Amino acid sequence: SFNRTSFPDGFVFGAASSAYQFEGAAKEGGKGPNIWDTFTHEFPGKISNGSTGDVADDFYHRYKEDVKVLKFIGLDGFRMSISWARVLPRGKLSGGVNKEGIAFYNNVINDLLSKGIQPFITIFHWDLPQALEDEYGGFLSPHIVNDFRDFAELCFKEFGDRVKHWITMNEPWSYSYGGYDAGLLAPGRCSAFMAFCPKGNSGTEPYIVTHNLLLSHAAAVKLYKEKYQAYQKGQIGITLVTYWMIPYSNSKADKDAAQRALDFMYGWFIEPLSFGEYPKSMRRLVGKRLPRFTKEQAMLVKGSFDFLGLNYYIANYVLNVPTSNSVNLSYTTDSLSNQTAFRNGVAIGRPTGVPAFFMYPKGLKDLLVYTKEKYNDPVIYITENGMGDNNNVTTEEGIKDPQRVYFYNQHLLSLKNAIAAGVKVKGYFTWAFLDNFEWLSGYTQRFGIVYVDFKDGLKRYPKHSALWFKKFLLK
Ligand SMILES: *[C@@H]1O[C@H](CO)[C@@H](O[C@@H]2O[C@H](CO)[C@@H](O[C@@H]3O[C@H](CO)[C@@H](O)[C@H](O)[C@@H]3O)[C@H](O)[C@H]2NC(C)=O)[C@H](O)[C@H]1NC(C)=O
Numbered sequence: 057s058f059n060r061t062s063f064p065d066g067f068v069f070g071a072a073s074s075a076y077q078f079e080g081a082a083k084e085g086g087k088g089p090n091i092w093d094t095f096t097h098e099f100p101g102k103i104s105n106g107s108t109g110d111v112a113d114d115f116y117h118r119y120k121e122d123v124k125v126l127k128f129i130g131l132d133g134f135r136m137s138i139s140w141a142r143v144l145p146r147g148k149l150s151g152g153v154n155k156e157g158i159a160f161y162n163n164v165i166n167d168l169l170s171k172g173i174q175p176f177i178t179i180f181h182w183d184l185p186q187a188l189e190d191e192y193g194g195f196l197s198p199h200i201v202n203d204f205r206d207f208a209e210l211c212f213k214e215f216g217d218r219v220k221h222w223i224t225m226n227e228p229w230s231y232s233y234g235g236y237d238a239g240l241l242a243p244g245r246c247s248a249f250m251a252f253c254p255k256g257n258s259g260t261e262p263y264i265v266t267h268n269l270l271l272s273h274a275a276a277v278k279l280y281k282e283k284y285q286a287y288q289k290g291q292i293g294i295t296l297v298t299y300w301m302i303p304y305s306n307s308k309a310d311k312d313a314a315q316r317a318l319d320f321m322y323g324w325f326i327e328p329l330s331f332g333e334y335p336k337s338m339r340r341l342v343g344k345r346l347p348r349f350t351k352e353q354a355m356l357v358k359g360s361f362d363f364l365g366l367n368y369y370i371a372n373y374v375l376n377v378p379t380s381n382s383v384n385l386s387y388t389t390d391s392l393s394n395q396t397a398f399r400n401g402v403a404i405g406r407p408t409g410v411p412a413f414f415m416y417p418k419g420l421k422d423l424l425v426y427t428k429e430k431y432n433d434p435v436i437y438i439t440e441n442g443m444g445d446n447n448n449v450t451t452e453e454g455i456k457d458p459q460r461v462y463f464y465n466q467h468l469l470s471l472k473n474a475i476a477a478g479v480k481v482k483g484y485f486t487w488a489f490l491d492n493f494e495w496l497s498g499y500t501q502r503f504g505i506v507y508v509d510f511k512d513g514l515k516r517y518p519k520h521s522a523l524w525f526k527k528f529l530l531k
Pocket residue numbers: 407408409410446448449
């Protein structure tokens with residue numbers, strides 16, 4: 057039966073997590089507030105059922121038993137993130153290191169390694185300390201770069217003797233678009249015409265924030281390369297997300313619109329990372345709302361990754377949107393494109409428990425080949441791939457997830473094809489290890505290969521998908 061021998065020797069199979077979504081202990085162990093503590097508490101209308109990550113999976117206390125589950129499944133690796141405000145409660149290094157926070161991550165890492173599981177560490181997975189958001193508006197300010205750099209350094213110093221795979225940040229697209237265009241994610245900023253956020257500007261701030269995200273990423277990578285990489289002997293990268301874009305029709309209009317959508321979502325980050333400049337379509341359509349890289353900045357950002365982390369979930373069809381005399385000025389409308397999961401009333405693939413998300417495993421290969429061909433054959437890890445179930449059945453029924461078995465069977469076959477096509481994929485991580493706090497969707501969506509019974513003591517039960525992976529891994 058389909059198993060890991062179909063993949064390169066030493067290929068890393070793992071599961072993924074993030075700190076705010078899993079940890080809980082949000083006000084414990086010396087931890088300071090982050091923007092997600094603030095967002096979920098002050099805007100309960102923006103979270104399904106007014107949920108928070110106050111407790112989440114309580115991974116902070118339950119990590120020892122959870123690591124046993126990872127070993128049971130037989131995973132090679134585990135992707136997890138560092139809570140910035142847990143290790144630096146005041147955000148700045150000068151504000152002091154929280155010894156209790158450092159100890160937790162050390163404990164998790166030491167346990168993982170005893171089970172032969174490699175920790176892949178995301179330094180920043182959106183949970184910015186409130187102190188930094190308060191001081192200078194977080195990623196709206198160039199001040200964020202030095203503080204991000206110091207945070208990265210703390211991680212390298214404290215964990216780098218054991219951690220050999222670093223991811224600077226998770227999905228700066230989501231942080232910028234979600235936090236500053238649509239106002240759906242912390243810090244919850246958007247234009248007043250949306251009547252959805254207290255402050256913001258969806259037409260300017262996402263571009264400001266993305267620039268500082270890239271610069272912060274680049275600062276961390278430069279420091280790692282110059283100061284830690286030679287003796288710790290690890291690798292550092294960044295995780296990007298994009299939908300795969302398919303033109304709605306055969307028209308030139310829809311063809312160009314599809315590429316514009318990809319330019320604005322993916323190219324926004326991977327062209328600076330590869331070429332030191334933003335995509336031409338963005339420069340043309342966004343004009344002077346799009347920051348320029350100085351010569352120093354372009355030099356720092358270009359080539360600043362050892363590997364690319366890619367998160368893949370879905371493909372969408374893309375329609376051209378003609379220019380209009382009625383403008384809502386926003387990153388969203390700047391690309392003159394419209395995404396839809398339906399063509400001629402027919403869904404792009406099998407449904408999931410997430411209304412927008414349909415199964416399109418071919419898109420994983422297409423994205424990987426596109427990336428190989430456009431950006432000089434980079435080393436790639438699939439740092440997230442998964443699907444969600446609606447949280448509307450009993451624990452008993454939730455555990456039986458043949459649809460997720462199917463999902464991973466199909467996507468791993470597609471990944472196999474990408475590797476055969478010469479894409480240098482070295483690893484693959486399931487989102488998620490556990491059912492968790494899924495940001496604006498709260499606990500209404502279950503992405504785990506392991507079920508968490510939120511109603512009954514947060515108990516863990518491996519799903520059929522976990523058992524499928526256990527067999528796939530010959531473990
Ligand atoms: C729990 O929530 C899920 C939501 O994902 C429910 O499953 C979904 O049910 C809808 C409506 O029954 C399905 O859509 C329909 O499918 C039929 C036949 O395939 C189609 O002809 C209709 O036009 C309509 O599109 C949807 O596919 C399905 N989603 C899945 C399975 O992922 C489920 O009913 C809920 N369960 C309980 C116990 O409330």
